Every structure is written in C-alpha cells, then in structure tokens.
Write a protein that binds this DNA or RNA. Sequence first.
RNA 1: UAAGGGAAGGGGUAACCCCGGCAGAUAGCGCGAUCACGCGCAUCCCCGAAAGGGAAUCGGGUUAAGAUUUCCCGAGCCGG
RNA 2: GCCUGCCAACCCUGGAAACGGUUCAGCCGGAGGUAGGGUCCAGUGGCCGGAAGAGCACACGUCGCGCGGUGUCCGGUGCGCCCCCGGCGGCCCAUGAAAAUCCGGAGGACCGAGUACCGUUCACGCCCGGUCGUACUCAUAACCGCAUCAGGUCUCCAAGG
RNA 3: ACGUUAUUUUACUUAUUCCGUGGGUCGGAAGCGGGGCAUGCCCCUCCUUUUGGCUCCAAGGCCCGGUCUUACCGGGCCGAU
Lengths: 122, 255, 237, 50
Amino acid sequence: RKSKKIRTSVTFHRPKTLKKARDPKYPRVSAPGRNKLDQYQILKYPLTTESAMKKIEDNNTLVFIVDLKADKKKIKAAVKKMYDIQAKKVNTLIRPDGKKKAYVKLTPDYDALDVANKIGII
Amino acid sequence: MGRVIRAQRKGAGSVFKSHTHHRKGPARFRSLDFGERNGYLKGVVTDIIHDPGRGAPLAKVTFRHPFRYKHQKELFVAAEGMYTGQFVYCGRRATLSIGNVLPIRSVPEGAVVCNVEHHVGDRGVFARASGDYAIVISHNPDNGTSRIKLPSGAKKIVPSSCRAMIGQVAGGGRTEKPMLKAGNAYHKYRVKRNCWPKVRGVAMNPVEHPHGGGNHQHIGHASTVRRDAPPGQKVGLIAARRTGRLRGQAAATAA
Amino acid sequence: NPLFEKRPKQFGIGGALPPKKDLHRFVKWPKVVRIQRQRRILKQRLKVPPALNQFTRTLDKNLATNLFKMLLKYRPEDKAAKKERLLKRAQAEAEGKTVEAKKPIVVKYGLNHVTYLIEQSKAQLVVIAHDVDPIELVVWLPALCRKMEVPYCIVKGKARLGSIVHKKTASVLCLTTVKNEDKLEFSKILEAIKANFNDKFDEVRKKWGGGVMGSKSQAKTKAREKLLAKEAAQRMT
Amino acid sequence: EYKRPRLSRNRRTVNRPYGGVLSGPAVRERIIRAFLVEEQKIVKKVLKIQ
RNA sequence: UAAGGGAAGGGGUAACCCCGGCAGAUAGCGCGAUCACGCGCAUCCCCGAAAGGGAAUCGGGUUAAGAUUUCCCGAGCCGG
RNA sequence: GCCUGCCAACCCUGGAAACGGUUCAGCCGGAGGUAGGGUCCAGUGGCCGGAAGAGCACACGUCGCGCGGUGUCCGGUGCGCCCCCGGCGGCCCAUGAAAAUCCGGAGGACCGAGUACCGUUCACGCCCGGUCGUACUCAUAACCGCAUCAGGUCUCCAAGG
RNA sequence: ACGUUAUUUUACUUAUUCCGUGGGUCGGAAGCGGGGCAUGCCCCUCCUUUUGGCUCCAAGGCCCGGUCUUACCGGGCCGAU
C-alpha cells in the first residue's frame, strides 16, 4: 500500500511532533491448559439470630450469612435463583467471624415471612 | 578532628532546598524564527507579575499566535518604563525602544542594556539583579566581537549575535535602604534558598568549626586560608588580595 | 464574478503556516539515522589507509550490468532448485540406467572458498563487493589478487552480487571457467579493471585527511577572492 | 452546578459574543480595535509601495 | 492533585541499591469511526491530605447505641 | 414555586463652579457626576408548596402493645453572645498553591426537512446505581505512660447574673 | 629530495565539551523590492530588505483562486522560489 514518498512528505511539513505506525497481533492455537468451574455458593444459609428474626416481620428482609467475596450483584441473582424472589437491596457487614453478614431487602410482592418457612429462620 | 561543617550539607535534600515550585515560572526568551521588522512576533504586556524567587518583577508578555509549532508565552524580564498594552518585539530587526530584545550588534555603542547572553540562547546572564545594568562599550564594524562593560566593571568579549534587552532592569533601589528588623530579613531569606541566622565560628564548638573553642572569645588562627586548600580546610577569607578597610576599586580590566 | 468573491488571498508567510521547508534535513532522528550518515563523511576526514580508497574507484554501471547478463546463465541453485535436481538425477540413473550428467559450471562464492581459488589460480576473475560491514574482511580480497597477479574487479553493491546467488551476502563470486560462447565478451570484463587501474598502486593519502567540508568551502572562496583582488590591484596600478 | 445540569442553556451565557468571558464594555473595545487596524492597514500598504 | 514518593530509560554500582526517564520525538497513546481508514498529542503514569479540593438527602420513628448514617413515611437530588 | 438584597458593578436620562457625593488609604465625575428612572450578583426573609399526615404541650381513656378530642398564636428591643456571609481598609525587600472537576465564548465545518427531518444543554415519563468502613469509649477508668497513674493527648457546641 | 623528526605558537569540523527545543522557518543560491559604491552598462568584488508596524481584537482547517488528469464524485500541482 504505502509508497514511501507519502510518509516522507508528512514529516516534511512538520517540525517533528510524534510518531505513528501500527502492526498486528495473533492469538495461538494450542489451547492453554486448565479447564475449571471452581465456584463457591455465595448463599450458605439464612443466618439466625434474635436481631435477624425481628427484621423479617418489620421490614420484609431475610438475613443471610454469605461468602467473604460477596458484593450486591451476584447475591441478588443468587436469591432470585434459589428462592424465586426479587431483592431490592443487599447490605454488607464485616463480622469478627471473618465472613460477611448480608441483610437482603426483599420484595413486598412475595413476603419474606412466607419465603422464610421453607428455609426456616428464627 | 571533627564533625562535618554546615556548607557540605548543601548536597541534596528538601531541608536545604527552597520551594522552587512556588516560584512563578520560566524567565526564558522566545527563540526568534527570523526577521522581526516591527511586529512579526508581537507580545502584549498584560500584567507585570512579581517573582517571589528573586523579589523583583518579570513582565508578563503574552504571545498567543497559533500555527502548531508556534512556541510562545511567558515571562520576559521587566525593564523600566514598560506599561501594560505596550507591544514587545523580539528579534533581529526590532525597533529600538525600551523593553525590546534584539542582537547587541544592532544596538549602538554607549547604550544601556539589561540582560546579555554569554553565548546565544542562554537567555540572560549579565545584569539581572535590580538597579544594575551593563553598558555596551565598543563595537566598531566587528563581525566577531561586541565588547560590553559589565556592572562588575569588567570588559567582556562576547559574540555580536548575542541578544540584549534595551533599558535597565526594574525594581531598583531594593537593597539600598535598610531592613530595620531581624524579622524583615527572615521573610526574604525564607522565600529564597538560604538558611537565615548566621552563627559565628567562635560561638561554635572546636569539633564543629576550626575557629571555635578557647576560654575567651577569639578566632584562634589567621582567617585567610589558601584557594588551593582542599574542601574542609578552606575557611575564612579565601585568597584575600588585601584586608583592612581601604582603597580598592571595581573589577578593572584593561585593553 | 458570480462564482466567487475574493479571487486572491495571501496565506503563506506573515500569517498562516509557511511553505513546508527542508525538514528532511532538520528533524529529530532516531539513533540509527544519526550514525549511518556520519560514517561516509568520516571516511574522508580521517586519513584513509592505502588498501582503502583503492575502493570507491568502482567499476562502471554499463560494465557491471553486462557482467550480470553472463552470470544469468551461471546462477547458483535455490533451496527448491537443488532439492528438485536430486529427484531428477535419482530417477534417471536408477530407471533409465543412464551415465551421469555433464559437469556443472556455476559461479563459486563465499569468502573462504573464493580466496582458496585465488591461491590456486583457478579463478579467472573475481567480482568483489565494495561494501561489507567488517571492512577488514574485504581489504584482503583485492590485495591478494593483486599480489598473485590474478585480475579482479570491485563492483558496488554486496546485495547486487547476492541476488544472483539468491541468498544474502555473497561478498565475492567468481568464474573459474567460462563457456566458449561467453569467452569473447568475458575478455572485455578482464580489460575493464585495467581500464580504470592500468596503474601502479596508488596509496591514496600521504598524510591528507579531509575531503572538503561545506562550511569550509564557502569560507575558502571568500578568503581566496579577497586575496586575488588585492594581488591583482598591485600589478594593475 | 455550572455544568450540564438542572440549569437551562441561557444561565451559562450572555447572548452577546464573549458572553461569559469579557464584560461587555470590554467587548466593544476589541471591536473598535478590529475596526481601526483594517482601515489603517490599507492606507499603510499603498503608501509603502508608492 | 500538592509538598513529595516511585516503577519505566540511560548509566554507575558485581550486587543489593540510587539518580530518574529516554530513539512512548517518522515505536502509541487519544478522537472521529465502523468502514477501514484518517486526523491530533508527550514530558509520561500511579500513589500522595481517610484534614486540602470535592457528583449528589432531608424529616420522623426505633433498639443495647452513633442515626442525614439503621429503619420507615413523605419529598428530592445526582450520574449512567 | 412565586417574590425579594445593598454595597459592588452596569445601562439610560441629564449637563454640574457658590463644583458635588464620598473612604480608616482619596475615591465617584469631566473617557459624565450629584440627581431621576432602570438592570444585575440572590446571602436572606416573606407567603405558599414540603408539612402536620409530623412534632410539641394539654385534657380524657385504660377503651389496654394505646382510644377520641383540642390548642400549638401575635408583636417588640441592641455597642449583647456565637458563627457565618458581604464589601472595604492595614500589612509586606513577606504581595499570600496546583489538579480532578468544568462551562462559556470566538470558531463554522458538516448536516438540515414537510408530511417530514432537524433541535434533542427543555419539561414530563421508564429503569439502574457496584466495592469497602459504620458497635462504643474518646479519657482523674475503654488511648499512651508495666497500671481503673492527680500526668499527657487534635477538634466542633458554649445558658443566666 | 622524500619528507623525516622535535620544540613551541595558530587556524579548521568530525571526537569530546557546553547550551538551545511540544530539533521551525538554518545555510547557500536565486526570485521579487530597493539603497549605496566609481552608483559608469545592471555593478557583481557589497549593505539593507524579502507578505506581520499607532491602534489590551485577532493570525488555527498546509485557502480562496489559478492550473492539469478527471463529467460531477474524486486526486495532483500551484497559491507559499
């Protein structure tokens, strides 16, 4: 493509400036090793305490103890998969245990009390 | 022997260094394209900005013209009588008015200048401290050499291509009238690179300083030490031609 | 004019970007460009030994090109060509039962090979590259040929010789033998070197270094002109 | 507050040229300068050539 | 982002380690741009004040407690 | 939301001597004042929206983990106190940062249509907003001095005589 | 004669050295102005120039134009030696 005169002429009307050129890259074909699906269950169990119990009634919210690599996005998806409910917020607390306590605010359209019964929590 | 003395501490380190960053910017002179018969590089004084780093002003001259590779802007050294909105001309064929900078050859003999270049493009070497000025002593039709009598009084051979600015530098008289406080002295030295109080060599311990020690106050030995003397040794009045109070003069070369 | 209003305008200089100018001669170089340009210039500046600067006095373009036309016949094999030949020979000798091919005639090439041929006096003519990055390597080649009284020629372009062999640097290639048909025009080539060096060994710089420097040439003209004017005016009046 | 927000287009500007930039009596000073230079320039040019 | 610190470069120092950038300057980052191609540019690039500087919230209620902050009503406000 | 600020600043009128207004530095007006009429910065207050559906004080009720009702308003004063915010003035051989963040204007290429195309820095409507800390003490007892040590240890609120 | 060899002085651009930059408009010639010199035939052996001038604006799209391949589309060259 490039007929050498063109590059020379561009620099000719310039006082230096910078550079510019480009060149390609290629991915291999040999299949880098290790195929895996090591995956933790973010929801472990609904955490059960006196302070958990009151909140279910009061504010439509189950309280779980969850992994130490928790966020809000993954856990909301997980709650939807496993208990068929929409979660409106997830709230994150470090514990002196060294794991993360999750307060998960649930939908009013299917009440946390009647979610609770099949994965009982006090 | 002794612990190391205070001069050697310059070295590097923030503690001995000044706040050079606070200082307001470059003092540089924009390197002429060519030409300059009145206003081919036209500057406009828009401010005269104080420089804390020498406590005397540099005129803010703003060159603004475009292209892309155009190089412009910033602080040429202030001269007397300059005003805002007056145009500044920088280059070879520039008109002879105060505050304009041009090669020394085109400036006539006997003419007061401020700034000179000690080889082209080093931007200002001779006379920059306030109320001082060089006066260009000789030229003739000499391609090689312009001779300038400096504020030191020395007559210097320097190339005729070297730029100088017409006028004397501004802020004169600065040093002449007395501080009349220790506290006024402190503030000036704080802003520049100097540590303020001078402890005398006598007042220091014999370990720290050669002149220290002794029951009564005195410098123990002759103050004058050799120029050839090495670092550490070299103290007092170094290589003094004479001492005691009479009848010297300025630097007086002859040709 | 209905088409446009202002037919002339001055951009150019005193406003607008100027004519492009010679920025091929100015611009910030990479390091490699800096060193390569200097090397030829410095050849002049330092005194150049007797073995060198016999070089640079190279064979003519017309002579060089017709030399290559002879070599068109003799060209050495490619990687593919050699491999191909083995298959042809193997088939012919085994199945046909035919006696071996005619003796091959080609240029012989490579430093150690060719230099041995000069010693034995097998090589009729050797063609020597002007270039080659270790200059120590190639000073020996005309020197040895001259000593043994075997004719040689120095042609520009190490790459140009190399193209014929279909490789990289040949450095030298030579003809130990030539066909009877090529023999007549081969005589012209032998004459060619002793038609630019039918001379005794010019051992270039006596002490001389320099070659003329652009600034110095201008300075010299001015100095000469002033002197000439003065001298002429004394005689005249 | 002063960037892409509850505010409408007008509140960032004055309609005149150099609306936010120059004061208005300052703007006219540069219109005067623009006028003076162009008229003077033709007079200068014809004088020099002759 | 600052004072300042510190990879990257060149160079000493075996080396640890230290200055600190260089041929990121016709080595590529950035924008149109979906279309593959063109156009533009440095002193880079991160950390550095949980005090500098700053995208955006209030009220009431509650428990063992700070609540603009937890909770909740009602009303917003900012960014995508 | 509607309305509203004087200093500073600006517009228009007008043409001033018996010259004026005016600062803690002489500064407004002689490149147009004093004076008359406007305009702007919107700290702030007002009234309305928020928002009483709240909260506060009462009465009554146990009708209880709580029931029904009211009233909750209108002025005044300044060398007060604290803090803020405004525009000034003193200081200096001292003249008192930078960036993210970021709009503006100048620039006018390019793209502009009608039964649609262009605005989409506007209003209204729809969805979403991740990561980590939040206990509480903060000291004559939760900190540091072996320590429930008369010590020390950064900051905000600051009643009445 | 070929230089050879040794002291010092002195000079050039290539080592090295210093400094200038988001390496800019360098140098040499000639275009075009025009002057001074004996200004004579221009006057070379020279000196100023070579698109910008009061006038807190502004100089960005290598530009409009001219010109050529090229139906328009679109590309050169020149404008700006």
